[PDB]
């Protein structure tokens, strides 16, 4: 027998020979895209194989054999339906239906306290898919580039865990959420900021990752970091945000001097240093489709899921998925952890970091903040995502009355 | 052939005739107890054949086929390895491990409020396994009766939201822990008490239940819910601790007027009659196995694995283990859901009701507690569970580094 011939003949259809564009539309309704870094080989030899025989274009088993050899492990997986999501097509009919239903919710005010998000449409709406299998799917804004901001404190937390273990880090800064009025103290009991997902346990974490080096390789560091989290997707830099933020960010300073006085840091920190390293983090640039890949790899327990690359200790994505499910979303995190259940960071660019561990990570950016600072169409996507599918940390895989489970088919 | 011959060869081992005791034993090694109600056609009918005779006694193919065939769906799942954890007999030597691992850890004090708590042997420890497919394992002291106390707060929520929904409940209690200190708060700002986990969210939790009927009815409707939580297993009631606890509860009386003062009990509520009925619902008694089906219709979605009864709605369910996760385990709360990740209620009688969602419930019981109320021997073998195993609720199913899963075959 043969991987390549009898998924040739699965495609096949009794016929002799597939049409090139019929096996893109197959391999594309599994839910990868074409430009996938793990299916580069086999695009390559079918781009190469449309050059040298126009005489086509049509693949006989053999042919159609030497273009998928390279990758046939992830194209039978794909198409013998093995995927964490069998029908994808499906699901992300649910998800535009999710989108366009959160689309209506208009309420909310753009962050305005600095001028690079004042500058931000109210309108901008976007949501991107990005499966533990590298399935993608996209409706709205999702390529308009926005900054991390606060999205970012659980990717460098995790960062910070990975180099340097969960014990380590957490003599610095704890692991609880601080209670709905205790929201405005710098640090708890033990003199250490609360969870790393507050702003005050964000900068002391910021002033773990790569000691002894300057800003300038820590920045790189980190940005390497983000790209293999990205699958090296779009991560940029918005240099205006950070000259803003580091300008008007009176209160972070506070911190800073506080953190400093009470000896937070580690030894030999420049802590006005950090916190230029720290605005520089919130300032970095991501889209939905990047940042939903990011999340795709906290999902996936540490790999990228579009290049199969181990980015993140297992430890790391654990406890950053832990703090996430806890500390994430603000004021609202005891609710969110109540109602949605599942992992996410919200920032002031109207970003929303989603995780459902084992199958998918999800960006969800929409500018407009309600009262508690957290994007008004993220929140309302993010209920109408658990009240459709068993997602929620806490709904059982085999009774979930009447909610839709997209890992199973019939 | 058919379905009961097919397993019929399994057990045979070519042989012509399965002895009886070769059937039992084959059948214990899945993990199901002989007195698993789902079985009991197959043991009455087992129990009339060893009557026919005083031989052996030998089951041919046909007389096989007579006693399995009303419960052969459960006993092909249980033989041909479909069972959550498929091999349990090396798992159980695992929890094995880990309970003669805690036994060393002789820490702790019992609890000496009253003198029913005072008697207990610090040196009782039993722990209990039930799974979502009623695989059952127990190891120390698992059929000691001990009270429930504050381990009845999430079933006594589970029943509340169960007949009135999360809306109404949570008119009353809320959803959230208060932060480690605001513990001596009796309400959150919005004059709720914080959570169900709290004595004062369980007091007002208790005057939701069952309303307008007197107490001795709505002890005897719990004990029924209990029951059926429990596939009918050992659940009684300690007077002894119950008139102790009613007579030593002023912090909890202080907690009563409080709320009545601040109107947070529903129209109607004889508050010092809700409190007499407070104190026998902590009196309710369990053993390790009783108690650890409880967990585990928690974990099997509100489905007694013992019974297959639908026994609480997924909504009361998914709410009960949520606010087990973050609220469960008094100010190790925040602690237990970092390096645990597992739903868990502590008692003061030394117990902790464990929830593994989709594979398992326990319970663990040590009287003497750490100081925070904990059972120490409990505590202990819950880091090591998860230590071991990839059952943290961030844990990757997939990637999960050297950690076990017994959910897998590979
Ligand atoms: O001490 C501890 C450890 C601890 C914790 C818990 C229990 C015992 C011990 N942590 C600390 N972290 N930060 C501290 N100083 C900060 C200075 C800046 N902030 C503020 N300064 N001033 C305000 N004022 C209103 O916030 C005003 C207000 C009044 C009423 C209602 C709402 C708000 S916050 C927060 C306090 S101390
Ligand atoms: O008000 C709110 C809502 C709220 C929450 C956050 C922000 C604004 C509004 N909830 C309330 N719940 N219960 C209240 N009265 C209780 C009477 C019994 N307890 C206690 N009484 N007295 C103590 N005394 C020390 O606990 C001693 C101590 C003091 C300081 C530090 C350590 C120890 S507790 C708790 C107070 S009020």
Redesign the interface.
């Known amino acids: 027998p043969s991987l390549e011939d009898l998924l040739f003949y699965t495609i096949a259809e009794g016929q002799e020979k597939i049409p090139v564009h019929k096996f893109i539309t197959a391999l594309k309704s599994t839910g990868l895209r074409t430009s996938d870094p793990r299916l580069k080989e086999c695009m390559d030899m079918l781009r190469l194989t449309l050059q040298t025989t126009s005489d086509g274009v049509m693949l006989d088993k053999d042919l159609f054999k030497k273009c998928v050899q390279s990758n046939i492990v992830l194209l039978t997986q794909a198409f013998r339906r093995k995927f964490v999501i069998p029908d994808f097509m499906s699901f992300t009919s649910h998800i535009d239906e999710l989108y366009e239903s959160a689309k209506k919710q208009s309420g909310g005010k753009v962050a305005d306290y600095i001028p690079q998000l004042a500058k931000f449409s109210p309108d901008l709406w976007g949501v991107s898919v990005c499966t ?1 299998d590298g399935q993608r799917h996209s409706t709205g804004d999702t390529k308009v580039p926005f900054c991390l901001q606060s999205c970012v404190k659980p990717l460098k937390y995790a960062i910070a865990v990975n180099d340097l273990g969960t014990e380590y880090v957490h003599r610095y800064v704890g ?8 929201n405005k103290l710098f640090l ?2 033990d003199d250490k900021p609360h969870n790393p997902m507050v702003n005050a346990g964000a900068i002391v974490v910021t002033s773990l990752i790569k000691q002894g080096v300057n800003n300038a390789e820590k920045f790189d560091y980190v940005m390497q970091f983000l790209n293999k989290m990205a699958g090296n997707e779009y991560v940029g830099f918005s240099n205006a945000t950070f000259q803003s933020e580091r300008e008007s960010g009176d209160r972070n300073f506070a911190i800073g001097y506080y953190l400093k006085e009470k000896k937070c840091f580690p030894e030999g920190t420049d802590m006005v240093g950090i916190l230029d390293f720290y605005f520089q983090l919130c300032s970095i640039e991501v889209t939905c489709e990047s940042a939903s890949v990011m999340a795709a790899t906290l999902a ?4 990228c899921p579009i290049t199969g690359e181990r980015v993140l ?3 790391a ?3 950053t ?3 996430m ?2 500390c994430g979303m603000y004021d609202f995190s ?2 969110f ?2 109602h949605v ?1 599942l ?1 996410a960071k919200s920032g002031v660019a109207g970003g929303i970091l989603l995780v459902v ?2 199958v998918m990570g999800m960006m969800c950016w929409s500018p407009p903040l309600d009262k508690m600072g957290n994007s008004v169409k993220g929140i309302h996507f993010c209920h109408d995502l658990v009240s459709l599918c068993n997602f ?10 009447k909610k839709l489970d997209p890992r199973r088919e019939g």
Do not use: C, I
């Open positions: 533990a692991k609880e959420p601080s209670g709905l009025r205790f708890n009991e996936n327990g540490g790999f200790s297992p430890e994505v654990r406890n998925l832990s703090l499910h806890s005891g609710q952890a109540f259940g992992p561990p084992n929620h940390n806490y709904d059982n895989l085999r009774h979930f009355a």
